[PDB]
Amino acid sequence: VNTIYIARHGYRSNWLPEGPYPDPLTGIDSDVPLAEHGVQQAKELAHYLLSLDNQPEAAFASPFYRCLETVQPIAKLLEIPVYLERGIGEWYRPDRKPVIPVPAGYEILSKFFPGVISQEWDSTLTPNEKGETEQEMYMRFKKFWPLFIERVEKEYPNVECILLVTHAASKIALGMSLLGYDNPRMSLNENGDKIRSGSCSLDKYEILKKSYDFTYIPFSDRKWVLTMNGNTEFLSSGEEMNWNFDCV
Template sequence: MVLKTIYIVRHGYRENWLPEDQQRDSPLGDNESDPLLAPHGVEQAHELADYISDKLEPKPELIFSSPFYRCIETIEPTAKKLGLKIYLDRGLGEWYRRSRSHIPEPATIDVLSQYFAALSDEWLPETVVPSLEGEEEDELLERCRLFWEKFIPKVESLYPQVTSVILVTHAALKIALGMSLMGYQNTREFLRVEHGGDGVSTRIQASTCSLDRYEKNTNGWVMTMNGNTEFLSAGPEMNWHFATAQFEAGSKEDIEARKKAAQVANARPCT
């Protein structure tokens, strides 16, 4: 059998987006680059798990996650409900620009297994390892293209009975993975009609814990669910896109820019 359905979800709301006096220390010692989920993000993770286990069809048969803590924490409730292991792949890891002063490297599976019992090393070696020098947008898209080139045949070879998988990743990756899977050459393009867009205004949505679905047909992979948050009690939050964001998703600069934009919006007189 061949892979027919791919789900991609962004991690939940991060702890380091809260006021400093509400933040806990990450067990991995890096609150900025590898934070926990905030309590709200944990709630989102459980809402996601309930939706996947109760309503989503077809159900994912394998789970793959970025090795960053917040992604594993996001999908752990789903793994428990479905009775599945979690496979890590650095190809799904966070995007960092080349201009960043420090490129974080995720913890190893040996370290992460101390905190997450469902992790499995059966997927090793990973498909792609991102450059520790950072990536420009075109390099990220190429990473994702190479990821699919290796990932799909590997799944179909190792797990020939599996037709549906779910990937847990980050905002920029959620977009770049989807665009490369559908054959786009730029992360900033609008989606064509056959992918659920109108060619002039629709892009992949990447709010926290939002869920995308891609299905394979005779013409390739098509998007049949874009940024679904119907299962989240608070709806879409912290949406991000290459075309509208000046900073890396979730970074301090991103959060500060969002705060300033909100202050400006709130200061505008009513008309």
Template sequence: MTVKTIYIIRHGYRSNWLPEKEQLPILTGVDSDPQLAPHGVEQAKQLAGFISKELSPKPQLIFSSPMYRCVQTVNPTAEALGLDIFIEFGIGEWFKRNRGQIPKPLEASNMKKYFSRVSESWNSHTMTPSQEGETEEEIFNRCAAFWPKFIPKVEQQFPNAECILLLGHAASKITLGMTLMGYKNNRDYLREEDNGDGKTTRIQAGTCSLDQYKLDENTGKWHLKINGKTSYLQNGTEMNWDYGTSKFVAGSDEDIAYRRKLAEQAKRAESLVDGIPAESGSSRTFSKL
């Protein structure tokens, strides 16, 4: 059979996005590999409820980035559907070349110590991101090279699978989608046939947001049918990110600092209008930016 439906989802709200005193420890010992915040755990449960009860067709296979927060996000869905989780480095995080040391995520054998649903029966290195980091062009090239290797590999190992789910990060979620549909770069606007208008619409990448891609079997082309769905989340879209308007890598310290700065500026402006002094905000006052 042929893979005909692909869901791509971003992980939930990260612990290191909270104020420092509220952050949870990194369990894996891998740099930049935080747990989900309690809010992210709730998002993962809400996502699992939607997928298991409402989404159609249902995923038959689950693939996750090797980062803890990604496996943690998709684990409730795997539990609800009774599926294994396959680790796949090809959909992993984007680290820029100027970052310095690039984190080396856990292999499936070690991640299985934390999540029993993780299976070692998949060769996790369809593609492996460079340990020197990647430019925006290089992550695009990585994802473009990923699909021609990954889909035939899935169809060979799981010949009855028509619907699969990939759980990754904002940058990889967007780039995987753009390369799957045959766009030339990460910043293109979506054409009408891909649920866009060609002028303003890009792939949305809020936390725990879901995209659905369908294969046109007549043309062999993939099209985006659901873009960044978050209606199943109690707080809707949070921490949305894209290559065109965001100044920093998604979820990085610089990104979070910038979002907090914007939130504080907006709060001060609001207090001036209302004539009420601005108060210190909650840990997620900037989360919908």
């Protein structure tokens, strides 16, 4: 794998100004569906990814419903498999109320998204079901990356470009840990830039090349470069609901 795209799911139903708000179809607390506005964003994200020379060849999704609903049009249009990855699920802190949500598995989600999800992929790890402190959450992602890419490359040796569909904090923490920063709150550079994470925004990471255009490079020896930061130019909505750690 030499290219990684990371997207946030689309606009959430609970963000609309008034109820009634649809109940989670899975029965899981706060596992809400996309707003219609968010389904439109997901379709526009799909069409943008379709247009790329360097398209993802496989998608890994947080098993929260809103992430599956976002990846569905992407997978159908690009004709790529979708794998459930608990490792990139939402960040909940301990004592979050009323409960810490734990997302559903294949048995349940395959009913809502028929023909989309491949069962063969098991999760790389499972976030603490009692929640995670900020430090623990970032450690979750530092641990996740080498285990995850090692498995991807064993299972799908010919896949060079992948997509992850995830949540706001997880998207930023994934990117900051991939890039090797000490913590996810830091700025990227002296300009003060941060990874932007609007709904259906899209990040791209590429490896720094070690040869002129096979020599295996362990994941831990690869240097990644952020080459697209929270792009929403392909959305008719533009950027909505940007989140960063200043929001906590």
